[PDB]
Amino acid sequence: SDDLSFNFDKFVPNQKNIIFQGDASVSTTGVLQVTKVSKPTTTSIGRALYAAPIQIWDSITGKVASFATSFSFVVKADKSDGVDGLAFFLAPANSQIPSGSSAGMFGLFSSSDSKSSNQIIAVEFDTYFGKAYNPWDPDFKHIGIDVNSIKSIKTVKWDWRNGEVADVVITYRAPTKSLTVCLSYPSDGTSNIITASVDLKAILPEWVSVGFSGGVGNAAEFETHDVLSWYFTSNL
Amino acid sequence: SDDLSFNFDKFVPNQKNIIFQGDASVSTTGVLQVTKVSKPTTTSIGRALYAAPIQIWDSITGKVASFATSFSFVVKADKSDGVDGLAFFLAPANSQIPSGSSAGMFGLFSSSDSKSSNQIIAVEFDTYFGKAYNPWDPDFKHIGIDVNSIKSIKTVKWDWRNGEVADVVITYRAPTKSLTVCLSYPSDGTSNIITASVDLKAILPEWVSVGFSGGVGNAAEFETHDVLSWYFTSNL
Amino acid sequence: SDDLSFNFDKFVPNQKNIIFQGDASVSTTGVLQVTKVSTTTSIGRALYAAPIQIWDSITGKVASFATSFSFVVKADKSDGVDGLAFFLAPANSQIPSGSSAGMFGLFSSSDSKSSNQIIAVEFDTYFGKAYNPWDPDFKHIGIDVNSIKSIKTVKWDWRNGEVADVVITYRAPTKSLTVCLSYPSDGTSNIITASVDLKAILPEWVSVGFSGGVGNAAEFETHDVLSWYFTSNL
Amino acid sequence: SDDLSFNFDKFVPNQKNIIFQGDASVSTTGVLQVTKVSKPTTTSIGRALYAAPIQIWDSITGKVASFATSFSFVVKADKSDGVDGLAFFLAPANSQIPSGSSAGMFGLFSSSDSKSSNQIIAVEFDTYFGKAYNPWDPDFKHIGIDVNSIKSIKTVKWDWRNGEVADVVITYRAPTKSLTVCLSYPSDGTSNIITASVDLKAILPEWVSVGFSGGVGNAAEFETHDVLSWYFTSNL
Ligand SMILES: C[C@@H]1O[C@@H](O[C@H]2[C@H](O[C@H]3[C@H](O)[C@@H](O)[C@H](O)O[C@@H]3CO)O[C@H](CO)[C@H](O)[C@@H]2O)[C@@H](O)[C@H](O)[C@@H]1O
Ligand SMILES: C[C@@H]1O[C@@H](O[C@@H]2[C@@H](O)[C@@H](O)[C@@H](CO)O[C@H]2O)[C@@H](O)[C@H](O)[C@@H]1O
Ligand SMILES: C[C@@H]1O[C@@H](O[C@@H]2[C@@H](O)[C@@H](O)[C@@H](CO)O[C@H]2O)[C@@H](O)[C@H](O)[C@@H]1O
Ligand SMILES: C[C@@H]1O[C@@H](O[C@@H]2[C@@H](O)[C@@H](O)[C@@H](CO)O[C@H]2O)[C@@H](O)[C@H](O)[C@@H]1O
Numbered sequence: 002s003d004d005l006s007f008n009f010d011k012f013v014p015n016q017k018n019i020i021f022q023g024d025a026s027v028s029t030t031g032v033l034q035v036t037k038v039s040k041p042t043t044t045s046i047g048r049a050l051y052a053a054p055i056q057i058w059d060s061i062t063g064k065v066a067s068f069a070t071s072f073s074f075v076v077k078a079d080k081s082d083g084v085d086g087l088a089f090f091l092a093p094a095n096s097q098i099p100s101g102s103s104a105g106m107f108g109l110f111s112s113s114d115s116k117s118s119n120q121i122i123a124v125e126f127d128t129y130f131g132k133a134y135n136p137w138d139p140d141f142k143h144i145g146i147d148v149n150s151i152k153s154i155k156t157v158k159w160d161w162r163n164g165e166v167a168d169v170v171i172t173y174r175a176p177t178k179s180l181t182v183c184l185s186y187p188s189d190g191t192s193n194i195i196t197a198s199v200d201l202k203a204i205l206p207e208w209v210s211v212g213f214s215g216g217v218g219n220a221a222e223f224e225t226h227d228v229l230s231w232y233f234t235s236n237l
Numbered sequence: 238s239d240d241l242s243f244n245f246d247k248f249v250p251n252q253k254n255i256i257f258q259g260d261a262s263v264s265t266t267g268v269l270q271v272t273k274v275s276k277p278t279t280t281s282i283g284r285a286l287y288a289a290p291i292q293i294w295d296s297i298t299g300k301v302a303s304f305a306t307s308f309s310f311v312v313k314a315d316k317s318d319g320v321d322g323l324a325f326f327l328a329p330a331n332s333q334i335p336s337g338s339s340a341g342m343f344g345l346f347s348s349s350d351s352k353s354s355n356q357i358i359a360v361e362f363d364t365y366f367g368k369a370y371n372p373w374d375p376d377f378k379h380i381g382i383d384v385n386s387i388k389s390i391k392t393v394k395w396d397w398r399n400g401e402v403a404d405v406v407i408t409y410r411a412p413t414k415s416l417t418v419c420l421s422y423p424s425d426g427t428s429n430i431i432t433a434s435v436d437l438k439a440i441l442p443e444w445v446s447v448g449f450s451g452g453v454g455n456a457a458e459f460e461t462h463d464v465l466s467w468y469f470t471s472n473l
Numbered sequence: 474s475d476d477l478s479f480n481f482d483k484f485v486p487n488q489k490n491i492i493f494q495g496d497a498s499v500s501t502t503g504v505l506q507v508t509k510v511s512t513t514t515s516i517g518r519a520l521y522a523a524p525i526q527i528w529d530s531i532t533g534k535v536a537s538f539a540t541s542f543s544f545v546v547k548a549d550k551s552d553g554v555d556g557l558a559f560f561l562a563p564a565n566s567q568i569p570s571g572s573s574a575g576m577f578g579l580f581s582s583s584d585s586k587s588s589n590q591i592i593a594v595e596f597d598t599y600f601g602k603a604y605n606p607w608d609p610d611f612k613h614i615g616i617d618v619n620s621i622k623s624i625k626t627v628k629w630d631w632r633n634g635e636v637a638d639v640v641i642t643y644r645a646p647t648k649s650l651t652v653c654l655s656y657p658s659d660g661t662s663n664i665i666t667a668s669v670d671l672k673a674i675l676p677e678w679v680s681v682g683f684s685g686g687v688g689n690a691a692e693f694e695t696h697d698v699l700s701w702y703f704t705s706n707l
Numbered sequence: 708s709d710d711l712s713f714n715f716d717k718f719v720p721n722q723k724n725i726i727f728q729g730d731a732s733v734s735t736t737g738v739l740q741v742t743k744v745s746k747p748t749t750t751s752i753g754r755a756l757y758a759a760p761i762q763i764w765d766s767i768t769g770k771v772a773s774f775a776t777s778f779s780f781v782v783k784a785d786k787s788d789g790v791d792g793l794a795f796f797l798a799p800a801n802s803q804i805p806s807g808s809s810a811g812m813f814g815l816f817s818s819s820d821s822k823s824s825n826q827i828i829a830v831e832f833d834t835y836f837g838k839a840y841n842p843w844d845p846d847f848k849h850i851g852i853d854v855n856s857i858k859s860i861k862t863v864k865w866d867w868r869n870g871e872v873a874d875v876v877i878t879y880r881a882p883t884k885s886l887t888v889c890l891s892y893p894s895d896g897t898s899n900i901i902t903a904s905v906d907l908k909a910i911l912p913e914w915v916s917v918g919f920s921g922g923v924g925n926a927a928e929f930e931t932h933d934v935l936s937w938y939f940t941s942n943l
């Protein structure tokens with residue numbers, strides 16, 4: 002069959018096949034809280050990666066992997082608004098959180114540049130877009146395809162629903178270098194979609210680590226970044 | 238594993254696990270032409286079903302199946318416009334083309350009513366919306382969720398691209414009765430999405446047949462309705 | 474992914490994706506009784522409703538497949554007839570005219586006709602010389618290729634009324650067909666492997682399923698399959 | 708789908724999703740040599756584990772995982788005989804090679820006892836059975852089910868073929884606690900099978916690591932322990 006395919010219908014406290022970085026952890030209710038949710042709400046950054054690296058492309062053959070992923074998340078804000086967002090990403094194998102990372106950078110970037118050495122490809126669900134602190138962002142909550150920079154190469158208005166569960170399907174078809182993000186809220190039928198061209202071979206190393214990351218930059222505008230389930234499959 | 242899952246990366250002439258109805262057939266290039274394509278263009282209606290029925294729900298247990306499907310199609314018009322459209326549908330097991338079916342009805346309906354006995358659920362990619370002959374349609378090319386009637390319960394502007402390949406992902410999550418249609422053109426990054434609530438148990442019989450259908454109502458405004466690949470999986 | 478893969482954890486009465494031939498049917502308990510249980514002589518076959526492309530003439534590719542199923546053969550006395558079989562036959566094949574129960578509804582005769590185009594794995598319970606002269610001197614598992622006279626057999630340590638788990642794999646690149654049988658009840662296991670070139674025996678499109686028979690109503694036994702997993706890939 | 712399922716049709720030098728212990732490594736031909744092969748030949752012990760732990764049972768629900776694995780290996784001896792053997796095993800998550808491990812213990816055991824704390828379940832393909840050094844073994848090359856001890860709870864004559872490729876299928880059906888080992892040589896049709904009852908819940912921790920191990924106890928009776936491919940899937 003395919004090179005790899007795993008599925009988590011629920012998460013268990015201290016799941017040993019998930020690497021936790023930052024404030025990420027799984028509650029006793031079986032939900033992955035990439036961002037810390039506590040009594041006195043605090044600033045936070047967290048990342049959760051699947052324990053084993055994945056071969057996204059082969060230097061011997063030239064083959065590039067096609068992958069698909071599905072997951073359901075909830076972002077619940079106390080007030081009508083929150084910060085900072087959630088992201089699904091592919092990074093160099095067993096990558097660590099960059100030194101001096103902002104919550105608005107989702108623990109994925111050291112700065113706001115477009116360094117080729119970053120080697121990150123992420124799909125952000127950006128809830129904060131204030132010009133004062135996030136000048137790169139557009140003027141609304143968005144879904145964005147990030148390639149080596151927090152300044153998305155393509156964005157789309159994200160009709161975020163507070164506290165509602167969202168179903169996301171992300172597919173990457175290697176032969177056409179097409180990355181599609183399918184988001185929908187079964188609650189009221191709201192749907193957002195976005196597609197972009199990305200050549201994984203040109204951006205990522207042979208072996209990568211996949212996972213989620215997120216952050217809360219200001220404790221006063223707190224919101225959760227909980228992923229409920231996660232399906233993933235790749236194939237060379 | 239799952240109750241069923243099949244994949245066709247290409248089609249072969251006279252594929253024996255696909256039932257051909259009407260003018261449907263697969264060319265020597267390995268593409269399923271649900272709608273007949275010929276030098277002297279003609280009116281046409283065709284349907285192609287997977288040879289084996291699928292249990293979409295169980296009366297014993299009450300369980301409803303969740304399914305997902307993926308396929309890539311091309312609709313190439315000679316002029317700047319064409320008719321009539323393509324559709325992915327679920328119909329009663331080993332269903333036959335209704336007597337007196339219009340091309341604008343995609344060979345799925347005998348009339349324009351909303352008869353409960355129809356027992357059809359389809360996702361249409363409607364290219365013709367003229368009021369004279371298709372009064373039920375909206376004022377633009379659309380993607381529509383059809384439930385027992387050609388008058389879609391929900392539609393969305395379909396930014397059709399002539400001759401370009403479109404990638405479609407359709408998921409139905411039984412627990413939330415959520416049907417999502419994800420369409421994208423890797424060519425220029427155009428994407429369309431739509432979601433609706435549908436209770437399969439209330440509309441379809443226990444055993445159904447899945448497939449594609451399409452039609453060309455007027456030979457003068459000819460266009461192709463070719464599906465290139467097809468992945469499908471369901472599970473109770 | 475793979476060209477095809479289906480799984481039945483239980484069967485439903487009148488399952489519409491299974492073609493029933495002969496006396497085959499599924500009881501209300503959700504078990505596929507390929508052989509009629511009531512008492513009487515019987516022959517039955519059950520095929521998955523859709524044909525499977527076992528090899529491609531364009532590319533030359535041959536499919537590799539694997540199947541898993543659990544069955545029970547319960548005899549009233551200490552012995553029964555006739556057996557059960559998993560087979561691959563020409564697409565939407567029908568039961569041959571004048572078929573014996575000892576032929577499992579797969580063969581018109583006892584020859585080795587190239588035109589038969591059948592490949593089956595038999596779980597033969599009857600081996601009497603009077604009627605089944607081709608069989609060995611014991612209950613066996615046999616790989617059948619175009620003939621009821623197996624090309625290779627193995628003593629089958631059958632357990633009356635006990636559930637058996639079978640795993641059959643065919644690895645196209647080595648033309649290796651392996652049959653893995655085991656009884657979780659007491660740990661009894663039987664295994665057999667043979668070389669078979671599907672391309673040389675079967676047509677491009679085939680139908681897979683089970684068949685079985687009861688040749689003598691006095692030595693009755695059931696031929697019930699409980700579950701069935703199957704996957705193939707070109 | 709299932710909790711996990713991966714497949715390696717070939718191995719790449721320094722595969723990052725395989726943890727190498729001891730002398731294990733993958734040659735440039737793409738084969739996993741769990742046991743070191745070099746000229747001159749030397750004593751050796753090696754283990755290769757899939758990089759991510761697997762949840763074999765759940766303490767919350769009580770569920771036990773069913774799994775299946777398939778792999779092809781070759782054991783090529785210089786003379787007519789070799790030592791010591793190969794083994795597929797399940798051990799505590801991210802387990803390390805026990806201190807003072809013999810090659811005849813396959814790098815899985817510190818001693819020859821039956822300590823409950825070992826928490827190992829392995830399927831050995833034992834090529835050496837000499838009484839002088841391996842008194843626990845039977846009087847022939849065998850396949851054995853090991854549970855917390857190198858003294859197999861059940862064995863079977865293994866009709867080993869020098870240099871020939873063997874196909875192995877191992878299935879564990881949780882509901883019946885049935886572990887079956889299916890071995891066959893496509894070369895001449897030789898087949899060996901063995902089944903035993905094992906309760907994973909009673910022997911292994913919730914999270915385990917799966918892989919292969921093997922050893923060469925005496926360089927003078929050298930043989931290879933190469934695995935060519937590996938498929939694995941588990942499900943709770
Ligand atoms: C002590 C014993 O060691 C292994 O047994 C292997 C045996 O190793 C001997 C070796 O033959 C001898 O020259 C040396 O002096 O002592 C070693 C062990 O002390 O060699 C044979 C081949 O001739 C096999 O490889 C034996 O497996 C180990 O496997 C035993 O478990 C035990 O610890
Ligand atoms: C200096 C910046 O700090 C953070 O910016 C925060 C925003 O993301 C948001 O949380 C607002 C809410 O009012 O507070 C800001 O402090 C980082 O996210 C950003 O990247 C800069 O480092
Ligand atoms: C009476 C109607 O006939 C057909 O309508 C056609 C359209 O679908 C389209 O092909 C246009 C192109 O100019 O021609 C129409 O005749 C049916 O499709 C429709 O359902 C009505 O029966
Ligand atoms: C007349 C014969 O009937 C079947 O043979 C039976 C055997 O299979 C076995 O059941 C014995 C047990 O005594 O009874 C036989 O009747 C056919 O298989 C055979 O070909 C004959 O037609």
Ligand SMILES: *[C@@H]1O[C@H](CO)[C@@H](O)[C@H](O)[C@H]1NC(C)=O
Binds near residue numbers: 099101110
């Ligand atoms: C960003 O992270 C990398 C971590 O390796 C580091 O090299 C770089 O110095 C960091 N940025 C800053 C501003 O230090």
Ligand SMILES: *[C@@H]1O[C@H](CO)[C@@H](O)[C@H](O)[C@H]1NC(C)=O
Binds near residue numbers: 334336337347
């Ligand atoms: C519409 O189609 C169904 C096909 O089964 C048929 O019963 C009905 O008679 C058809 N309508 C007309 C007007 O015949």
Ligand SMILES: *[C@@H]1O[C@H](CO)[C@@H](O)[C@H](O)[C@H]1NC(C)=O
Binds near residue numbers: 569580581582
């Ligand atoms: C055997 O079966 C085939 C069925 O097509 C038939 O052609 C043949 O005549 C049958 N044998 C006899 C003796 O009739």
Ligand SMILES: *[C@@H]1O[C@H](CO)[C@@H](O)[C@H](O)[C@H]1NC(C)=O
Binds near residue numbers: 806807816817818
């Ligand atoms: C066996 O291995 C473990 C490794 O952690 C160790 O605790 C134990 O001491 C070893 N046995 C001997 C005899 O040292």
Ligand SMILES: [Ca+2]
Binds near residue numbers: 138
């Ligand atoms: Ca932001």
Ligand SMILES: [Ca+2]
Binds near residue numbers: 321322341363371374
């Ligand atoms: Ca229309």
Ligand SMILES: [Ca+2]
Binds near residue numbers: 555575597598599605
């Ligand atoms: Ca017989």
Ligand SMILES: [Ca+2]
Binds near residue numbers: 792833834
């Ligand atoms: Ca030994």
Ligand SMILES: [Mn+2]
Binds near residue numbers: 139
């Ligand atoms: Mn952004």
Ligand SMILES: [Mn+2]
Binds near residue numbers: 363374375
């Ligand atoms: Mn319409």
Ligand SMILES: [Mn+2]
Binds near residue numbers: 608
């Ligand atoms: Mn026989």
Ligand SMILES: [Mn+2]
Binds near residue numbers: 831843851859
């Ligand atoms: Mn041993």
